[PDB]
Write a protein that holds these residues in place. Structure first.
Motif, PDB file in Angstrom:
ATOM      1  N   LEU A 217       0.831  -1.198   0.000  1.00 10.81           N
ATOM      2  CA  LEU A 217       0.000   0.000   0.000  1.00 10.81           C
ATOM      3  C   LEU A 217       0.869   1.252   0.000  1.00 10.81           C
ATOM      4  N   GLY A 218       0.614   2.146  -0.953  1.00  5.73           N
ATOM      5  CA  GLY A 218       1.354   3.382  -1.053  1.00  5.73           C
ATOM      6  C   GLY A 218       1.906   3.686  -2.436  1.00  5.73           C
ATOM      7  N   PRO A 219       2.443   2.689  -3.134  1.00  3.57           N
ATOM      8  CA  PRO A 219       2.833   2.904  -4.530  1.00  3.57           C
ATOM      9  C   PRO A 219       1.645   2.792  -5.474  1.00  3.57           C
ATOM     10  N   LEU A 220       1.859   3.282  -6.691  1.00  8.27           N
ATOM     11  CA  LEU A 220       0.883   3.208  -7.766  1.00  8.27           C
ATOM     12  C   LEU A 220       1.591   2.780  -9.040  1.00  8.27           C
ATOM     13  N   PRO A 221       0.882   2.130  -9.960  1.00  9.33           N
ATOM     14  CA  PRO A 221       1.508   1.751 -11.222  1.00  9.33           C
ATOM     15  C   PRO A 221       1.930   2.982 -11.998  1.00  9.33           C
ATOM     16  N   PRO A 222       3.002   2.884 -12.782  1.00 11.66           N
ATOM     17  CA  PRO A 222       3.463   4.050 -13.545  1.00 11.66           C
ATOM     18  C   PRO A 222       2.399   4.535 -14.517  1.00 11.66           C
ATOM     19  N   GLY A 223       2.288   5.856 -14.634  1.00 15.14           N
ATOM     20  CA  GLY A 223       1.287   6.473 -15.474  1.00 15.14           C
ATOM     21  C   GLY A 223      -0.041   6.737 -14.800  1.00 15.14           C
ATOM     22  N   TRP A 224      -0.234   6.261 -13.575  1.00 14.58           N
ATOM     23  CA  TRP A 224      -1.459   6.493 -12.824  1.00 14.58           C
ATOM     24  C   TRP A 224      -1.223   7.571 -11.778  1.00 14.58           C
ATOM     25  N   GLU A 225      -2.142   8.530 -11.709  1.00 18.33           N
ATOM     26  CA  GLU A 225      -2.043   9.593 -10.721  1.00 18.33           C
ATOM     27  C   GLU A 225      -3.430   9.953 -10.211  1.00 18.33           C
ATOM     28  N   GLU A 226      -3.454  10.543  -9.021  1.00 20.57           N
ATOM     29  CA  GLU A 226      -4.683  10.897  -8.329  1.00 20.57           C
ATOM     30  C   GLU A 226      -5.055  12.344  -8.626  1.00 20.57           C
ATOM     31  N   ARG A 227      -6.357  12.608  -8.708  1.00 21.28           N
ATOM     32  CA  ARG A 227      -6.873  13.950  -8.919  1.00 21.28           C
ATOM     33  C   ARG A 227      -8.091  14.156  -8.031  1.00 21.28           C
ATOM     34  N   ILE A 228      -8.369  15.418  -7.720  1.00 23.90           N
ATOM     35  CA  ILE A 228      -9.452  15.796  -6.820  1.00 23.90           C
ATOM     36  C   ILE A 228     -10.555  16.451  -7.637  1.00 23.90           C
ATOM     37  N   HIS A 229     -11.752  15.888  -7.547  1.00 21.36           N
ATOM     38  CA  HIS A 229     -12.958  16.419  -8.160  1.00 21.36           C
ATOM     39  C   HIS A 229     -13.794  17.145  -7.112  1.00 21.36           C
ATOM     40  N   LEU A 230     -14.645  18.051  -7.593  1.00 21.31           N
ATOM     41  CA  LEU A 230     -15.474  18.871  -6.723  1.00 21.31           C
ATOM     42  C   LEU A 230     -16.349  18.005  -5.820  1.00 21.31           C
ATOM     43  N   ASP A 231     -16.902  18.646  -4.787  1.00 20.79           N
ATOM     44  CA  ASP A 231     -17.664  17.971  -3.735  1.00 20.79           C
ATOM     45  C   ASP A 231     -16.807  16.956  -2.986  1.00 20.79           C
ATOM     46  N   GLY A 232     -15.500  17.209  -2.922  1.00 21.04           N
ATOM     47  CA  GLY A 232     -14.584  16.352  -2.195  1.00 21.04           C
ATOM     48  C   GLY A 232     -14.520  14.932  -2.715  1.00 21.04           C
ATOM     49  N   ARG A 233     -14.024  14.759  -3.936  1.00 23.65           N
ATOM     50  CA  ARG A 233     -13.910  13.445  -4.547  1.00 23.65           C
ATOM     51  C   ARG A 233     -12.466  13.183  -4.949  1.00 23.65           C
ATOM     52  N   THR A 234     -12.059  11.921  -4.866  1.00 18.89           N
ATOM     53  CA  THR A 234     -10.718  11.493  -5.246  1.00 18.89           C
ATOM     54  C   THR A 234     -10.840  10.414  -6.311  1.00 18.89           C
ATOM     55  N   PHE A 235     -10.188  10.621  -7.454  1.00 13.75           N
ATOM     56  CA  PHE A 235     -10.246   9.641  -8.530  1.00 13.75           C
ATOM     57  C   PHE A 235      -8.868   9.450  -9.140  1.00 13.75           C
ATOM     58  N   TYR A 236      -8.544   8.204  -9.467  1.00  8.89           N
ATOM     59  CA  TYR A 236      -7.258   7.855 -10.052  1.00  8.89           C
ATOM     60  C   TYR A 236      -7.418   7.669 -11.554  1.00  8.89           C
ATOM     61  N   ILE A 237      -6.520   8.282 -12.326  1.00  7.85           N
ATOM     62  CA  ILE A 237      -6.562   8.213 -13.779  1.00  7.85           C
ATOM     63  C   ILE A 237      -5.221   7.706 -14.287  1.00  7.85           C
ATOM     64  N   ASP A 238      -5.235   7.213 -15.520  1.00 12.55           N
ATOM     65  CA  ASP A 238      -4.052   6.672 -16.173  1.00 12.55           C
ATOM     66  C   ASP A 238      -3.676   7.563 -17.347  1.00 12.55           C
ATOM     67  N   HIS A 239      -2.429   8.029 -17.360  1.00 12.01           N
ATOM     68  CA  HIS A 239      -1.924   8.801 -18.485  1.00 12.01           C
ATOM     69  C   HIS A 239      -1.359   7.925 -19.590  1.00 12.01           C
ATOM     70  N   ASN A 240      -1.252   6.620 -19.359  1.00 11.77           N
ATOM     71  CA  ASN A 240      -1.046   5.652 -20.429  1.00 11.77           C
ATOM     72  C   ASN A 240      -2.425   5.232 -20.920  1.00 11.77           C
ATOM     73  N   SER A 241      -2.796   5.707 -22.112  1.00 13.76           N
ATOM     74  CA  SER A 241      -4.144   5.596 -22.664  1.00 13.76           C
ATOM     75  C   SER A 241      -5.106   6.476 -21.876  1.00 13.76           C
ATOM     76  N   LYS A 242      -6.080   7.066 -22.563  1.00 14.61           N
ATOM     77  CA  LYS A 242      -6.957   8.069 -21.964  1.00 14.61           C
ATOM     78  C   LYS A 242      -8.067   7.355 -21.204  1.00 14.61           C
ATOM     79  N   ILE A 243      -7.781   6.995 -19.955  1.00 12.13           N
ATOM     80  CA  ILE A 243      -8.714   6.253 -19.114  1.00 12.13           C
ATOM     81  C   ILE A 243      -8.873   6.990 -17.792  1.00 12.13           C
ATOM     82  N   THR A 244     -10.119   7.150 -17.351  1.00  7.74           N
ATOM     83  CA  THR A 244     -10.439   7.768 -16.072  1.00  7.74           C
ATOM     84  C   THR A 244     -11.289   6.804 -15.257  1.00  7.74           C
ATOM     85  N   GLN A 245     -10.916   6.604 -13.995  1.00  9.09           N
ATOM     86  CA  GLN A 245     -11.599   5.652 -13.131  1.00  9.09           C
ATOM     87  C   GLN A 245     -11.798   6.264 -11.753  1.00  9.09           C
TER      88      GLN A 245
END
Length: 639
Positions: A217-245
């Motif tokens: 717990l603590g590392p992430l796969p390369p190309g994946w980073e966390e972003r903050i969405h409004l209403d206090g939301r946390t979502f992880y996206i991949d910059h390898n291929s345009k994927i948002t999760q």
């Protein structure tokens, strides 16, 4: 009787006729057999040009069927002919296919249209310079029926031909390489030596003009980073291929396919997360102090920055002390140290890096670095450590590179769109092979290599010399050609540089970016003068300067942010920097060529780019919204 005769007077009508050439010389592996012949009829006394003719009727064929006749009225008393054959597909190399000098002195009994000579006399090609090789014969016919040592160079100067094929002069007196002819009498009393002084002073202000992205717990796969969405939301996206999760990718496979935010590529937040993740664990000395002499800045550093036992000491704060200097060290002396060390390191004199092919102000790893220096490995590790330290401390490094360099540093594959920025000729030949049928070339799996004065043959694959290329297998042939030309030649030195880089930074923290972002991260983010850019950009194929499409394009360009404008500039010209003199010196593959917009493609297609000619192919668009959307999509997807 057709024409092409502007002498008249007391002159004699003579017909020349070229027939063909047999076994023409070539040094391109592929062959690049696209020649053209220049006929120059002149006077043997003053050698002034009198008649100039050029023909080109053969493309991609070693033996050209040039059965061409020319009639001209001159006196054969004191006149001569020059046949200069050149190659239109030997850019960045000596295209001097050959030269032949024909004297008009023999003058045999010639009866055109009233005789059957059937001779077509062959003449051997004659070289003109030591940087030229000629092979084969040229077939000529003549008819006349009717009547009634290089220049010396200053001491310390020497000329070299880099692996690309161009030439450059290197001076050992001041240890500097340049492109133009060697300078004349030095007479460097104050003005000539001040030219170097003002050049450094002018360039030094440029370095401080550019600014880093953050100061803008603590590392992430390369190309994946966390972003903050409004209403206090946390979502992880991949910059390898345009994927948002939404849910974290780690082991949360069942929780997928949610209403994630639209994909967006933001650089400031990316750098913020990068600098947040990078940390120095454990303990380290709190004062990494070094002392340097200016004239030996590159040398002395190599005996300290490399002689360190462990890389952790590098992660500490840096302190520099220059000889005969006692100024303050408020993070500016380190910046000047980085700039000066970078300017000394990235010099072709040491042979570590050589200028690219798409431009003449960028650097790439020299595949022939083994011959120039016996210990390229250690210096490349040194440069990797310097780059890693520069990225770690957040300073700026004044060293640029071409796209494939960063693409390899990210561990990505190489394609033709990458090779176009290392050598124009190979890219053109490979694209021609891919688009057209290779049967005309009739080149089998063989590579001809000359070493130590002897030329031998090698095979990409076993039994390659006994299999000819055809359809349905050109993909593997071009892939192996890429491997032999670029990837395999410089893989070891690039691997050494990558190891030096990763000795100071984790390598899983760099795959988050792409090939268009590491250049900005290391060299900093520059500034572009949009007005001077506009006044120095030609348009063609009906795109008027006030044509609606150009107006919308310039409005969108002046409407974008600094980062996206820089990305567009990098996507077009292949480099995120502009010449210090201005936009008027934006060089290209075949000499200087300004920013250019072209009318090309269907209205429902994304614009294309050509870094070799610095061109942007933009289809016409209806309104501003469509152009802004399409241009933004193309820039965000610049690949």
């Amino acid at each position: 009787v057709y024409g092409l005769s502007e002498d008249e007077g007391e002159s004699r009508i003579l017909r020349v006729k070229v027939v063909s050439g047999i076994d023409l010389a070539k040094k391109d592996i592929f062959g690049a057999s696209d020649p053209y012949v220049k006929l120059s009829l002149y006077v043997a006394d003053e050698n002034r040009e009198l008649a100039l003719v050029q023909t080109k009727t053969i493309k991609k064929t070693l033996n050209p069927k040039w059965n061409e006749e020319f009639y001209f009225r001159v006196n054969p008393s004191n006149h001569r002919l020059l046949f200069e054959v050149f190659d239109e597909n030997r850019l960045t190399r000596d295209d001097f296919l050959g030269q032949v000098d024909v004297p008009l002195s023999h003058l045999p009994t010639e009866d055109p249209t009233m005789e059957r000579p059937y001779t077509f006399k062959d003449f051997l090609l004659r070289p003109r310079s030591h940087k030229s090789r000629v092979k084969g014969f040229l077939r000529l016919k003549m008819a006349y029926m009717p009547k009634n040592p290089p220049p010396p160079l200053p001491p310390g100067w020497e000329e070299k031909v880099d692996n690309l094929g161009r030439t450059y002069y290197v001076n050992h007196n001041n240890r500097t390489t340049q492109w133009h002819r060697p300078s004349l009498m030095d007479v460097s009393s104050e003005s000539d030596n001040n030219i170097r002084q003002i050049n450094q002073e002018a360039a030094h202000r440029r370095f401080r003009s550019r600014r880093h992205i953050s100061e803008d717990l603590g590392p992430l796969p390369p190309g994946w980073e966390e972003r903050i969405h409004l209403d206090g939301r946390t979502f992880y996206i991949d910059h390898n291929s345009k994927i948002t999760q939404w849910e974290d990718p780690r082991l949360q496979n069942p929780a997928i396919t949610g209403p994630a935010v639209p994909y967006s590529r933001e650089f400031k937040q990316k750098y913020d997360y990068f600098r947040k993740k990078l940390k120095k664990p454990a303990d380290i000395p709190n004062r990494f102090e070094m002392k340097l002499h200016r004239n030996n800045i590159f040398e002395e550093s190599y005996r300290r920055i490399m002689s360190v036992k462990r890389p952790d000491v590098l992660k500490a704060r840096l302190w520099i002390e220059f000889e005969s200097e006692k100024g303050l060290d408020y993070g500016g002396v380190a910046r000047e140290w980085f700039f000066l060390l970078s300017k000394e390191m990235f010099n072709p004199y040491y042979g570590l890096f050589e200028y690219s092919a798409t431009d003449n102000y960028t650097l790439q790893i020299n595949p022939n670095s083994g011959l120039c220096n016996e210990d390229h490995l250690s210096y490349f590790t040194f440069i990797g450590r310097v780059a890693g330290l520069a990225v770690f401390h957040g300073k700026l490094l004044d060293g640029f590179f071409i796209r494939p360099f960063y693409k390899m540093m990210l561990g990505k594959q190489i394609t033709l769109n990458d090779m176009e920025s290392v050598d124009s000729e190979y890219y053109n030949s490979l694209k021609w092979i891919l688009e057209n049928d290779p049967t005309e070339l009739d080149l089998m799996f063989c590579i001809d290599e000359e070493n130590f004065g002897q030329t031998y043959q090698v095979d990409l694959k076993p039994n390659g010399s006994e299999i000819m290329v055809t359809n349905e297998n050109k993909r593997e042939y071009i892939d192996l050609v890429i491997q032999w030309r670029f990837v395999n030649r410089v893989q070891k030195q690039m691997n050494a540089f990558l190891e030096g880089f990763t000795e100071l930074l984790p390598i899983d923290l760099i795959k988050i970016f792409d090939e268009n972002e590491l250049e900005l991260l290391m060299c900093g983010l520059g500034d572009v003068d949009v007005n001077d850019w506009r006044q120095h950009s030609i348009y063609k194929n009906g795109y008027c300067p006030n044509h609606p499409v150009i107006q919308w394009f310039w409005k969108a360009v002046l409407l974008m942010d600094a980062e996206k404008r820089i990305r567009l500039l990098q996507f077009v010209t292949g480099t995120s920097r502009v010449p210090m003199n201005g936009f008027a010196e934006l060089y290209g593959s075949n000499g200087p060529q300004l920013f250019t917009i072209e009318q090309w493609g269907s209205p429902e297609k994304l614009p294309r780019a050509h870094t070799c000619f610095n061109r942007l192919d933009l289809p016409p668009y209806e309104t501003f919204e469509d152009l802004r959307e399409k241009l933004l999509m193309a820039v965000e997807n610049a690949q």
